[PDB]
Amino acid sequence: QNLKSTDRAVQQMLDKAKREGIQTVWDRYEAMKPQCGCGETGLCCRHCLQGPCRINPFGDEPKVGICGATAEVIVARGLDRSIAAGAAGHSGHAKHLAHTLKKAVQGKAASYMIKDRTKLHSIAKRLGIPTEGQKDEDIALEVAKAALADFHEKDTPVLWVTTVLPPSRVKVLSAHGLIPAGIDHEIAEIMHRTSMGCDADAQNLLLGGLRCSLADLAGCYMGTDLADILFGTPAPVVTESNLGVLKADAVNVAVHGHNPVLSDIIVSVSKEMENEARAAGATGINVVGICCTGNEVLMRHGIPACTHSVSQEMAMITGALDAMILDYQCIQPSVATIAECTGTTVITTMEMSKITGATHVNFAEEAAVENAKQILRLAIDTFKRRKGKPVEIPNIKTKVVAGFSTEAIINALSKLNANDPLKPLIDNVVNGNIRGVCLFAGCNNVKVPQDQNFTTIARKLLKQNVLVVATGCGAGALMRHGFMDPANVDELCGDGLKAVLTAIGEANGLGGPLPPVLHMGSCVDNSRAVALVAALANRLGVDLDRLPVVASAAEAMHEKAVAIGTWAVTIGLPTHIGVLPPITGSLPVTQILTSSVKDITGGYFIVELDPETAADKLLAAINERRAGLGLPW
Amino acid sequence: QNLKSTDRAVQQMLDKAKREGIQTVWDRYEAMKPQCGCGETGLCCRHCLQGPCRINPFGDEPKVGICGATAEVIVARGLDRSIAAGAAGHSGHAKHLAHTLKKAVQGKAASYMIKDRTKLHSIAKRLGIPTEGQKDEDIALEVAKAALADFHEKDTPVLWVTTVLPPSRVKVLSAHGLIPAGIDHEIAEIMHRTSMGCDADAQNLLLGGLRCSLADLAGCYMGTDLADILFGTPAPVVTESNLGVLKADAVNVAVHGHNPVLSDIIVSVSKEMENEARAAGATGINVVGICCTGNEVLMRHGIPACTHSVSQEMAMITGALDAMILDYQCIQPSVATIAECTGTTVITTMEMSKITGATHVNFAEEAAVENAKQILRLAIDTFKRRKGKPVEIPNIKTKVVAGFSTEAIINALSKLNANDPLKPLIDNVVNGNIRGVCLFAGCNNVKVPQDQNFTTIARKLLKQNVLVVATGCGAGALMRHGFMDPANVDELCGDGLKAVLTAIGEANGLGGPLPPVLHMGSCVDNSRAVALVAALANRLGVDLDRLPVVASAAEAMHEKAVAIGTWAVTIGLPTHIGVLPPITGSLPVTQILTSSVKDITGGYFIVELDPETAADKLLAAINERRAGLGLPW
Ligand code: SF4
Ligand code: SF4
Ligand code: FES
Ligand code: FES
Ligand SMILES: [Fe+3]
Ligand SMILES: [Fe+3]
């Protein structure tokens, strides 16, 4: 079971699933081997009904697609479509938040409001909207309008790109025509240009993909902005993670997916429903988190994270998960089938995200509170049905310090320097206490023993004094193995990093260091790390491709992770990916993505499947950046 | 060679290609056999980096994707993405025309203007824009604004759907939530909902696809509207088709692709460049058409159609094709490679559609005339280089009567009834002289002997008195085999159809019938057939799913054809497809698309690979519609 997951709680539930005959994601993976190699390397195209066209990576015919598409055109078109799909996900999430905010301030959805008015005003200022003498409702209306306008062409380019990166970075990108004109505009142009008999030049196609990845960044940054306005900017919190946060005697309710628009309501509403839960024989309602909507409510409310990504089925295998409340993205549709074995009530809430066999509750922001109680009453009912059943919850959980928004990080640092908060961080980079910064992002992947790449790479960077930040299921992986527990700083961190984390923590009244890894939130909250890195660049007066900052999508799965990896490259970062993206069938495309893009954006992909080697390569990229600034390393 | 193409000119050029060693689309197809069956049936998914997930159509494991996605979810997601890609193509084309028109009336592009002011006023009226007391420039500005607004969410749904179908049809579609909210909005939502861990219910997914197909119809109808305003509504024309329209002693210039924004300029500009061509030793510039941009200039100017679709390479094999001017869509990228063997200058003109090895001229509407002369001078240069070379142009061509816009058809019929022009058509349907109407649409496919399905089905419907209309490469197939020559009416048409075609032709001063098949234009001009069918429904006071009208994508290839087939079903038509779409791996999806969608929209797919059987099935669908209206059959 160790070959499947490094998580001990997951290993325990795999044994339970095996002996009960419940098929898991790892069993379905085993049944899929040997997997198709052509697809695995990108050398397959089904973009017209003359296909499928497959090209063998090596040997004899076929060597080109039926229409004449070369290996490099086929690879580049496939990648562009996956970038577009990721952008469509992150941007659909942000779009729903934009409508939610507009409804809130237009009197239509009273469950929603401007919770962070400071953030609302900073956003409108960054965008050029008038704060002085305006009602907040009017300002927010304008912010929601600008958000929605960024999806289509207009007289300005996408503002959630051009106003969030330094002007020098926007200049480099404009010179190559990489600034998106509109988020859904770019998505559609990708789908056009990659369709049969259209763009057939690898470099032309990949430049389009870089631009579409920036549309994805815009949607990430928009999603983070709008959720912070609506639900509050995260500040440091203390909670727990892993399966042991489930409680046999409570109504256990998982919130799962990405969009917190209803799950934030679930959180507050469940608190009111406590006595109804006690009346049913439970101690209360225990809301827990799965995947990114779990990260959202962890970041803002301290909701414990139950599990993540590849291992999400294992929460139900405990037999104690009474409800799983779903919005969209990264939900294994197998949960609907597994629910008949485990008694879990699986509920979908989003019109465009249903699963055959799951109960559907038509969530509307206008009825959110009523929708929540209906869903939670179903969870209470399910708890009743299992009264007296035995459950198997692994008694395994870790302590998690999280809530490090960029505002929270700046405030932590400001306790060492009130009017130049970034200076103590830069000082410690300059003097070597902080070698550099690494962002871990993205998913788990069934092909990688769960969390193995995240923890292996994390351990080696921390020993080398890298400041490590994390989002999404990268944060999930690190949090479930103790990397967000300050009591582990001594074991994990180099001497220089320990001193800095300790200096900041002791200045924030903690009497203990910051945690070894800073949890910056969900997948769209990768945009928080961009805001921190951009503010660092603006403070140093250099572009991002000169900073000792790198990114690692160490166990990437989703098309969203591919989009994120691509805009990290596009804004200038060396970007590790720890799973093979479908590009190895074309050396020209690989050479563009890992070498010659350096001369366009300054960033580049690092494809490395061995986690110890990936750590060496990330350190080398960090150190090259250090030497380029004249620093020691 | 007969197994490859039923076109004798194509067969002759295949022999030339074989003996010169030039590899063709049919050779590349042969090298691809046996093709992957899983892909061919839809049972493959690469929507995340855990894949590819393939399911065998029959037998043992694997039976589900790694994430739990069933065969029916995988099939439905793949189809939805192909519908989205088609919509992205048709809508990108329309979007470029919208910008071209706005530039024209804003004084920025003097090569462009309002050529059809009657059409401009009818469009603004259909949309609710004020004609009275407004400059045409102001009206056109508003029309272009409404066009661009239909790409994103707003207070109205997509007007190029809701204002072009009968209100009863819009009502049926609204009741199922099928009206698009915005063209690129729907494209992106498809890419979201089909990404990993999102929509996982076949019926939910296919309803989304129906709605996205209507976004494709909107883009088709927008493209036709804007091109008619800019370049004139087609009226009946006489020309020729097939390779024999090339002339050894002229500068032969093919316009190839879909968007006529530059090719219409090529047409008029080439006329001015005649003496420069004579000075070079040519008789002049012989502009000819390939694929849909060829259909555009044929419909409006009588430009001869040289060839279409699967056989486009064969035009260059003559050795007489001096330039091939490309915009986007359905261009085999092999033309760039074949050009080094044939001396052809291949020129791309669109920023998002380049081909490695082709000369690129950066067309801008603001410099269109200058761009045209530069491209045409290159064609003159290439003619010079081949002065004295032998060429092999097959002396094979057919006579083509075309230009039957819906306005042209209504005007033809109005010579039999001036103030009720649709009545003579309906009368002859009622009394049986016209059994019904069939629209042939879409591509050639290398898997089908070129034109075999179009002509076989056409021959049997015409003998049964079906009024046959055609667009795109369906029109190309029928025109190259004599189906647009009135001299063939006697051979091809039933007695009832002959009498009607003769009655209309003799009323239009022709002294001869209309041609056996009415050429309604390019692929976006499938929207013309919708306008005719909707006007027929509105005249009879019934919905489209009660009319004896059917559609046949007899040799479908492109994702655009899949979108078109799907919106024909969605507006209510029995819709034949003569190539296997990737759906046979899921019986539930097949059953939805061919049977139970009947209860939603009234239309349905007819999947039939044998052309004689497909003809019987189309006739049966026509006759069922006849009996439902109480008519004899
Ligand atoms: S677009 Fe080209 S390579 Fe792709 S399936 Fe069609 S013929 Fe094959
Ligand atoms: S989305 Fe599901 S079925 Fe598709 S490749 Fe990923 S794991 Fe496989
Ligand atoms: S041949 Fe396997 S992915 Fe297409
Ligand atoms: S396994 Fe052949 S299309 Fe994927
Ligand atoms: Fe996740
Ligand atoms: Fe074509």
Residue numbers in the entry:
A (entry chain A), B (entry chain A): 4 to 636
Please give sentences taken from the publication describing this entry.
Among viologen-utilizing biocatalysts, Ni–Fe carbon monoxide dehydrogenases (CODHs) with a unique [NiFe4S4OHx] cluster (E.C.1.2.7.4)12,13 serve as suitable model enzymes for studying viologen mediator interaction sites.
Unlike aromatic F41 (WT) and F41Y, aliphatic F41 variants (F41A, F41V, F41L) exhibited less than 0.5% relative activities. The observed loss of activity in F41 variants of ChCODH2 prompted us to consider whether the alanine mutation affected more than just electron transfer, potentially influencing the properties of the adjacent D-cluster, including its redox potential. The results showed no significant difference in redox potentials between WT and F41 variants (0.28 V vs RHE), indicating that the F41 mutations do not alter the redox potential of the D-cluster. Furthermore, the structure of the F41C variant showed no changes in the FeS cluster environments, including the D-cluster. Thus, the diminished activities in the viologen reduction of F41 aliphatic variants are likely attributed to disruptions in electron transfer, affirming the key role of F41 in facilitating viologen interactions and electron transfer within ChCODH2.
